[PDB]
Design a binder for this molecule. Structure first.
Ligand code: CLA
Ligand code: CLA
Ligand code: CLA
Ligand code: CLA
Ligand code: CLA
Ligand code: CLA
Ligand code: CLA
Ligand code: CLA
Ligand SMILES: CC1=C(/C=C/C(C)=C/C=C/C(C)=C/C=C/C=C(C)/C=C/C=C(C)/C=C/C2=C(C)CCCC2(C)C)C(C)(C)CCC1
Ligand SMILES: CC1=C(C/C=C(\C)CCC[C@H](C)CCC[C@H](C)CCCC(C)C)C(=O)c2ccccc2C1=O
Ligand code: SF4
Ligand code: SF4
Ligand code: SF4
Lengths: 119, 86, 51, 670, 79, 184, 125
């Protein structure tokens, strides 16, 4: 008969539109209370820290987060910058290149990514 | 927690400090303006984000800028009353 | 789509007389319908279908 | 005294507010100038000026209402077919409103009489005139003249009181005096005056017309001189309202005159009682509510409630002659007062919020969380119950299971208290009819009436939730702890704390207007469908009734699809197919315009002002390119103004859509 | 069937139904086997995408990695 | 080979001559005075208005106003006779090909509107230039305003003379370009 | 802020004497009592005005639906006890949330029992 496929429907439709959705919702609310929940979008999860440290352990990605990464010979760059600043230093100015860069790198933003203290 | 940054264009109005409803901002001595003072945000963990400080700032573009971070909200940045997160 | 055309449909009959005939998307299995009488989507006792 | 009434401030726009004294630097200045125009509280000078402004503005508005009445009277005397309507009201549609023959607008005037073409008015002024014994054109001339004189008098009084009242003025604060004189002299001593007017001019006249002498021997009998007719000439014993006048299809005017006399007596006796009655409990209310905004809110709520009582009592408690058969007039008189009830209730809520922010609130604001929380729960309960009975009926009817739906022929929800509410009317076991038209038959309340009444209750409760939440959470909240310093109307407190948009009481009114509109659109539709289906309609000589909607309500209004099909689609055929049809062309056009305006409101409702500000700046670039610099700098509308414009256009467009839809259909059917 | 719409009634459009079964139960089971294979593989892929790449595998995993000889050419051919 | 059936109803000119570039040679259109749909539509208008007229009294003012309306309708029928209408609608068409010499052409209204709109814009711009103040925009200097309004008639020449002489436009480096998109 | 309906003597003693709060009750006893109440009540809305309200049985269907509702709310309670883990019913030195889980399991048992008892009363009487 044209029916006889409803034997499959009477099991599949209740299953996949009631049992599977209910199990999925229960599993989702259970997953919501894991410490790993939404670790890719929610800040301050343990797995995020472990993944970042794992990336940092790779020899290629050691100095990857540094915005100044790339200077093949930073000593040459610093020496050239110091020489160029010496010829342009205003009168009896007492600022050197080294401490100027050191104090231009050190800013005061305590409340930046402070969420790296729980997980 | 949000991010409240103070820029050099500050002229020491103190209006931003007075407008803050949770004592996030404060006045610190400085030497970059005739008022010899600039604002500071030492307690942005209490910054709800009302942006009243930005409303009160009279510089051409705000010397104080509040950057909203919604995936960062804490109980203080949300103003939770019925519920404690501590 | 290919399965439901193969199983819960009438491709073998629509191909013969396509102009006045109507194809079937898939069967309707919904326990909320009337367990009595016949729905307007079925030829009396036959199963329920969608165009 | 009056030497200070100078025109020097007419050119100086924005003088009244000290925030506008800096000059029109931006276009926001214009909108602020219009917004603060009537806000006498925040305007410059002392409190005495506030009282002077309020009282004189009240007088000026009263003069405006008198001018409107005078215009209606002159239209009735010189631009109307009121003569032939008097001679034959059952065959002539009222019309005191013509249209000039320009741009083909001549197509709007329609045949109302063999000698008159015009727009059928549905204000019911002709029935009012007939109930006011107005027969000759001279009477309408003198009514218009008296109304114009009243307009001039009230205008002059408003002009005078701006300088008669002074810093020492205190007559407005004497609330005992106001209440006593108002009550006695107006509600008592003017109700008996109108009873005198009726006894001496209506009963001498309206029985003469009902006696078939529309001639009335011209002035030989109509012009009073009929002291041989007796005051209670045709009371016919019975009880007032049980037996209607068979000729005019209304309550006998002798009974109305007796009602006014007795109500005046009752009001005078209540004024005498108020010398010693129950007090010392409303006394906290007495001392804490002496302020402009609180009394304004109280009066607005009271007047709106009276308006809804008028709306429900003007339709099936017929007082006016030849008015019950005039179905468009009945429909308009119900629905207009319904809308005014909703609007003035919303205004009462707004001014309650304003009073809370200006004055000091009362004890009920301290347990505001239980109040506005059980209100939330009840709103959710009756929304998830009333509406869903419609959703349940709809789903099970679509599934083909009509025996499982909530209907009379199915699981039935009997209106137990209404079915046991035969107390009202308590008329004899039949109907009343005048001329092929049903005057009133008792509305047999069933399941659909139960469900729609619960829908009404739910919508009312949600609107009240919005209003009371705005009122109680005006000063402060767990969300923002200094809402008092933010003022009455503000866009927000900022994107902080997750977002603080629309916390002000003004925004609570903004939402409450939408919810009131949604509340009484259902009221309008319930009335418009129920009356057509179960009350109004033709008749058969064999006592059979053929209504206009053929009893669609009890069988279709149980499902939302029934409302969509049998009300908004089938009964919209008159308005939609109204082009080139003489009477109803403007109604079809206004239907289209109402749709346009309603959709236009959504641009203001859905969008924020920052996008429009940036677009305006982009355009201002092109203007500055060609040396076209507007020194009143173009600024986009403020957030509150954007919301206000959106709400106004939304309500106006929707009201116009319903207005056209109901009026065109009732004009075609009649 | 109870038709709706003007055209179906005024043209006599009908929807034929096969009196046979279509697919036998064996064919449906054969399709369900491969559907289950897809399902298992998709769950595995979802797990791998959720956890992402593990860079620290070179400290614990065996082998020494491999770059295919064409991948090297693609590296040094440019970008 | 019958282009009407080939293209599903629409017909093609199939002729390449300059004499067919005018709108009057289109086979879609037809002069209104010899179009059946035009006759039927205006006859129906006359019939409906006349049927409305008979409903009233003979000596009433409404009867006279309906007679005037009937005369207006017949005048409209005879006035649109030379206007082109489609061979299937009967509704006269508006020509937007720049013909300049056909009934219902859009060139004359376009010219008139462009002149008066440039007049309005020029008067407003002149007033704004001569009143470089916000106080003069809320309290209009009416004598100067009407002076500019009257002076705006020569806009098509004065505006061009300002365009070529560098007195209308302003270099982009003198007005606010817009929001910054970069700095770092 | 003390009100009559929550802080009056009757209100306090009524809330304290509920199965959830009654002193001296083992967690399974609270679960059993609450479940009996819920299971007995939940049969009615289905066996009457249900899809099979007019069938000759019309009550076994209601029994099955009530048991299903009891099971669903018991599953929800198990989710709550495995996620929030209330510890107000746990005895000293036990797995956290064990008291709540026992209460929920015995609520499921009591719901089954109350549903069956209501069905038995309906069929017999
Ligand atoms: C109480 C309301 C209700 C409920 C719960 C259902 C439930 C169902 N209907 Mg249904 N239906 C209803 C009312 C209802 N119907 C009404 C009033 C009509 C009109 C008469 C229909 C017409 C109808 C048709 C024509 C079909 C269904 C189908 C289905 C099933 C599809 C489930 C699925 O694949 O989920 C998937 C859910 C989503 C993708 C939504 C995600 C968000 C499901 C059992 C289908 C079916 O039989 O499937 C086998 C089907 O073809 N229904
Ligand atoms: C305040 C209520 C009110 C309203 C809404 C109207 C509205 C109207 N009146 Mg009217 N009128 C009013 C009061 C009012 N009047 C009063 C108080 C008087 C007595 C002085 C009149 C005396 C009057 C006459 C004598 C006429 C109208 C006419 C009209 C209509 C056209 C007006 C017109 O040509 O624009 C004029 C616009 C301006 C002058 C711009 C200012 C319009 C429907 C005319 C009409 O219906 O023609 C058939 C007409 O002939 N009115
Ligand atoms: C609701 C309407 C209203 C009310 C409550 C008042 C109330 C008042 N008027 Mg007033 N007035 C009104 C309308 C009204 N007027 C109008 C429409 C006019 C124009 C004719 C006037 C013209 C008027 C004059 C010319 C004077 C008053 C005066 C007064 C005061 C004493 C009059 C009295 O005993 O009564 C009193 C505060 C008198 C006053 O201020 O007393 C010192 C006074 O001199 N009124
Ligand atoms: C308050 C509004 C009001 C006004 C202004 C009038 C005005 C009038 N009524 Mg009237 N009337 C009213 C209400 C009013 N009525 C009401 C509510 C009723 C009840 C149905 C009546 C019933 C009525 C009747 C039955 C008659 C009038 C008549 C009259 C006219 C002359 C009588 C007169 O002025 O009384 C003058 C004042 C008095 C008679 C009162 C004197 C009482 C003394 C001072 C007290 C001492 C009595 C002693 C101790 C014993 C006059 C046009 C008469 C008429 O037709 O005349 C044209 C007439 O026959 N009226
Ligand atoms: C004793 C004389 C008397 C008479 C003849 C009437 C007569 C009337 N009253 Mg009435 N009334 C009276 C005294 C009287 N009243 C008093 C003393 C009060 C104060 C409590 C009222 C308060 C009152 C209200 C509040 C209303 C009426 C209404 C009505 C009308 C409906 C009657 C009806 O259906 O009753 C059935 C029995 C009718 C004209 C109604 C009305 O105006 O309908 C439009 C209405 O809403 N009356
Ligand atoms: C007796 C009635 C009454 C009175 C005396 C007042 C008085 C006042 N209201 Mg108020 N109000 C009322 C009814 C009333 N209202 C009602 C019924 C509502 C509900 C909608 C409100 C809602 C309301 C709000 C939300 C606010 C006020 C405010 C105010 C104050 C300043 C108003 C002002 O300057 O506006 C100036 C007048 C206007 C801007 C009028 C513009 C026209 C309106 C907005 C559009 C109407 C469209 C029109 C009907 C359709 C056009 C026809 C179309 C075909 C073209 C003042 C104390 C404001 C305030 O600050 O209070 C202290 C304020 O924020 N009221
Ligand atoms: C989909 C509906 C549904 C769900 C989610 C549950 C859920 C549960 N049932 Mg259950 N049950 C149901 C329908 C359902 N039941 C029906 C219709 C019946 C009647 C045959 C039963 C009869 C039943 C019994 C007899 C028992 C359960 C038990 C259980 C629990 C294991 C769990 C909470 C067990 C339980 O409560 O143990 C703790 C148990 O012994 N159920
Ligand atoms: C007090 C305990 C008790 C008693 C006296 C009965 C008595 C009865 N049950 Mg019953 N039942 C009980 C508990 C009880 N049941 C419980 C706890 C369950 C849940 C598993 C059921 C589930 C149940 C089913 C599913 C059915 C009965 C049926 C019956 C009847 C045979 C009989 C009247 C049968 C009957 O007659 O149904 C109409 C039947 O079909 N019972
Ligand atoms: C309406 C009313 C009310 C309410 C009431 C109520 C709320 C009731 C409830 C009731 C109920 C709710 C009841 C219940 C009951 C229950 C029961 C009675 C049960 C029993 C059970 C049993 C007995 C079981 C047993 C068992 C078990 C345990 C297990 C195993 C199996 C068996 C079966 C053995 C009020 C007061 C408010 C007011 C007015 C009136
Ligand atoms: C469109 C829009 C604007 C821009 C709209 C403005 C500035 C309206 C002012 C334009 C002129 C001044 C209105 C004057 C009236 C019209 C020119 C004509 C109306 C009547 C015609 C039918 C003739 C906002 O400023 C805004 C602000 C906040 C939320 C939403 C919106 C918003 O949706
Ligand atoms: S308001 Fe702005 S300018 Fe003034 S002190 Fe604060 S940050 Fe500086
Ligand atoms: S956003 Fe509000 S709370 Fe935060 S610093 Fe500014 S004023 Fe203070
Ligand atoms: S979106 Fe608008 S209303 Fe909401 S917080 Fe921002 S400025 Fe305020």
């Amino acid at each position: 008969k044209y029916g006889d496929q409803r034997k499959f429907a009477a099991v599949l439709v209740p299953l996949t539109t009631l049992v599977f959705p209910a199990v999925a919702m229960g599993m989702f609310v259970l997953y919501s209370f894991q410490e790993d929940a939404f670790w890719r979008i929610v800040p301050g999860t343990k797995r995020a820290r472990e993944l970042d440290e794992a990336w940092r352990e790779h020899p290629l990605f050691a100095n990857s987060k540094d915005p100044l990464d790339g200077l093949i010979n930073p000593d040459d760059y610093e020496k050239g910058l110091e020489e160029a600043w010496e010829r342009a230093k205003p009168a009896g100015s007492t600022v050197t290149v080294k401490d100027k860069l050191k104090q231009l790198s050190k800013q005061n933003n305590p409340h930046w990514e402070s969420w790296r203290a729980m997980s | 927690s949000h991010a409240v940054k103070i820029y050099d264009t500050c002229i020491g109005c103190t209006l931003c400090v007075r407008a803050c409803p949770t004592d996030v901002l404060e006045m610190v001595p400085a030497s970059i303006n005739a008022a010899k003072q600039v604002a500071s945000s030492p307690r942005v963990e209490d910054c709800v984000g009302c942006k009243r400080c930005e409303t009160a700032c009279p510089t051409d573009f705000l010397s104080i800028r509040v950057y909203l971070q919604d995936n960062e909200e804490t109980q203080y940045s949300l103003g939770l009353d019925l519920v404690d997160w501590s | 789509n290919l399965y439901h055309i193969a199983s819960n449909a009438n491709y073998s009959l629509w191909v013969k007389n396509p102009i006045p005939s109507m194809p079937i998307a898939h069967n309707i299995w919904d326990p909320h319908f009337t367990n009595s009488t016949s729905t307007p989507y079925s030829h009396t006792i036959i199963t329920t279908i969608l165009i | 005294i009056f030497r200070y009434i100078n025109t020097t401030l007419w050119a100086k726009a924005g003088h009244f507010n000290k925030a506008l004294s800096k000059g029109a630097k931006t276009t926001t200045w214009i909108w602020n100038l219009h917004d603060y125009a009537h806000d006498f509280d925040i305007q410059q000078r002392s409190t005495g000026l506030i009282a002077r402004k309020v009282f004189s503005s009240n007088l000026a508005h009263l003069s405006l209402v008198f001018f409107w009445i005078s215009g209606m009277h002159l239209h009735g005397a010189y631009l109307s077919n009121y003569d032939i309507w008097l001679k034959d009201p059952k065959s002539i549609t009222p019309s005191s409103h013509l249209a000039y023959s320009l741009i083909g607008q001549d197509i709007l005037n329609s045949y109302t009489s063999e000698y008159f073409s015009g727009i059928t008015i549905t204000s019911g002024f002709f029935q009012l005139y007939r109930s006011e014994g107005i027969i000759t054109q001279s009477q309408l001339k003198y009514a218009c003249a008296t109304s114009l004189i009243a307009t001039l008098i009230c205008l002059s009084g408003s002009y005078l009181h701006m300088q008669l009242m002074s810093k020492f003025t205190s007559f407005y604060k004497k609330f005992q005096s106001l209440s006593q004189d108002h009550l006695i002299i107006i509600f008592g001593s003017r109700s008996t005056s109108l009873s005198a007017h009726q006894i001496h001019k209506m009963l001498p006249a309206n029985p003469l017309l009902d006696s078939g002498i529309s001639k009335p021997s011209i002035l030989q009998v109509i012009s009073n001189s009929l002291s041989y007719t007796l005051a209670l000439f045709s009371t016919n014993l019975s009880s007032t309202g049980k037996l209607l006048n068979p000729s005019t299809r209304s309550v006998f005017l002798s009974q109305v005159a007796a009602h006014h006399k007795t109500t005046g007596v009752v009001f005078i006796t209540l004024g005498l009682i108020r010398f010693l009655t129950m007090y010392k409990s409303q006394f906290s209310i007495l001392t804490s509510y002496i302020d402009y905004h609180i009394v304004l809110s109280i009066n607005l709520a009271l007047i709106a409630s009276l308006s809804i009582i008028v709306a429900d009592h003007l339709t099936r408690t017929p007082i006016y002659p030849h008015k019950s058969t005039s179905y468009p007039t009945i429909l308009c008189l119900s629905i207009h007062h319904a809308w005014l009830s909703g609007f003035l209730i919303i205004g009462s809520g707004a001014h309650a919020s304003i009073f809370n922010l200006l004055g000091s609130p009362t004890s009920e604001i301290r347990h505001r969380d239980p109040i506005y929380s059980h209100l939330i729960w009840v709103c959710i309960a009756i929304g998830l119950h009333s509406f869903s009975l419609y959703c349940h009926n709809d789903t099970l009817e679509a599934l083909g299971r009509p025996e499982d739906i909530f209907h009379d022929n199915s699981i039935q929800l009997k209106a137990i208290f209404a079915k046991q509410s035969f107390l009202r009317a308590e008329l004899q076991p039949d109907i009343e009819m005048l001329d092929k038209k049903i005057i009133r038959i008792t509305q047999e309340l069933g399941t659909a009436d139960f469900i729609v009444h619960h829908i009404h209750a739910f919508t009312i409760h949600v609107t009240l939730l919005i209003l009371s939440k705005g009122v109680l959470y005006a000063r402060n909240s767990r969300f923002v702890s200094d809402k008092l310093e933010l003022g009455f109307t503000y866009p927000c407190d900022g994107p902080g704390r997750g977002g603080t948009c629309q916390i002000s009481p003004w925004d609570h009114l903004f939402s409450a207007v939408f919810w009131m509109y949604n509340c009484l659109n259902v009221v309008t539709f319930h009335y418009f469908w129920k009356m057509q289906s179960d009350v109004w309609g033709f008749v058969s000589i064999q006592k059979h009734i053929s209504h206009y909607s053929q009893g669609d309500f009890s069988v279709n209004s149980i499902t939302i699809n029934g409302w969509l099909r049998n009300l908004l689609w089938s009964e919209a055929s008159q308005v939609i197919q109204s082009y080139a049809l003489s009477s109803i062309c403007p109604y079809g056009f206004i239907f289209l315009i109402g749709h346009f305006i309603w959709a236009f409101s959504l641009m203001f409702l859905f969008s924020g002002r920052a996008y429009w500000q940036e677009l305006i700046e982009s355009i201002l670039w092109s203007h500055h390119k060609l040396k076209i610099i507007p020194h009143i700098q173009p600024r986009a509308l403020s957030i509150s103004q954007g919301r206000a414009v959106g709400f106004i256009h939304y309500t106006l467009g929707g009201i116009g859509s319903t207005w056209a839809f109901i009026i065109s259909r009732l004009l075609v059917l009649t | 069937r109870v038709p709706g719409g003007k055209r179906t009634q005024e043209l006599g459009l009908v929807i034929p139904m096969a009196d046979e079964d279509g697919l036998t139960d064996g064919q449906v089971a054969g399709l369900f086997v491969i559907a289950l294979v897809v399902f298992i593989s998709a769950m595995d892929l979802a797990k791998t995408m959720y956890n992402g790449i593990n860079p620290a595998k070179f400290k614990t995993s065996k082998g020494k990695g491999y770059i295919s000889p064409l991948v090297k050419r693609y590296i040094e051919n440019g970008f | 080979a019958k282009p009407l059936e080939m293209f599903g109803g629409v017909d093609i000119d199939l002729e390449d001559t300059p004499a067919h570039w005018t709108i009057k040679a289109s086979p879609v259109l037809e002069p209104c005075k010899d179009n059946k749909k035009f006759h039927k539509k205006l006859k129906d208008e006359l019939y409906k208005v006349k049927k409305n007229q008979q409903k009233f009294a003979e000596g009433s003012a409404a009867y006279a106003r309906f007679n005037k309306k009937i005369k207006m309708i017949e005048l409209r029928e005879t006035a649109y006779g030379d206007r082109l209408c489609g061979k299937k609608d009967g509704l006269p068409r508006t020509i937007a090909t720049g013909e300049w010499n056909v009934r219902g052409s859009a060139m004359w209204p376009a010219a008139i509107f462009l002149y008066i709109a440039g007049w309005i814009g020029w008067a407003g711009r002149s007033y704004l230039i001569r009143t470089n103040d916000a106080a003069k925009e809320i309290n209009i200097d009416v004598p100067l305003a009407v002076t500019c309004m009257a002076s705006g008639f020569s806009w098509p020449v004065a505006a061009w003379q300002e365009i070529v002489n560098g007195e209308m436009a302003v270099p982009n480096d003198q007005i606010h370009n817009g929001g910054p998109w970069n700095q770092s | 802020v003390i009100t009559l309906t929550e802080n009056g003597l009757f209100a306090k003693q009524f809330l304290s004497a509920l199965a959830f709060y009654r002193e001296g009750l083992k967690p399974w006893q609270r679960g059993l009592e609450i479940g009996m109440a819920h299971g007995y009540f939940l049969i009615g809305p289905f066996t009457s005005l249900g899809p099979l309200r007019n069938t000759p049985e019309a009550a076994t269907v209601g029994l099955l639906c009530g048991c299903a509702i009891v099971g669903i709310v018991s599953i929800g309670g198990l989710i709550f006890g495995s996620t929030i883990k209330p510890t107000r019913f746990d005895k000293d030195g036990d797995k956290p949330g064990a008291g709540f889980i026992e209460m929920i399991n015995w609520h499921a048992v009591g719901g089954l029992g109350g549903a069956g008892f209501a069905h038995a009363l309906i069929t017999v009487f």
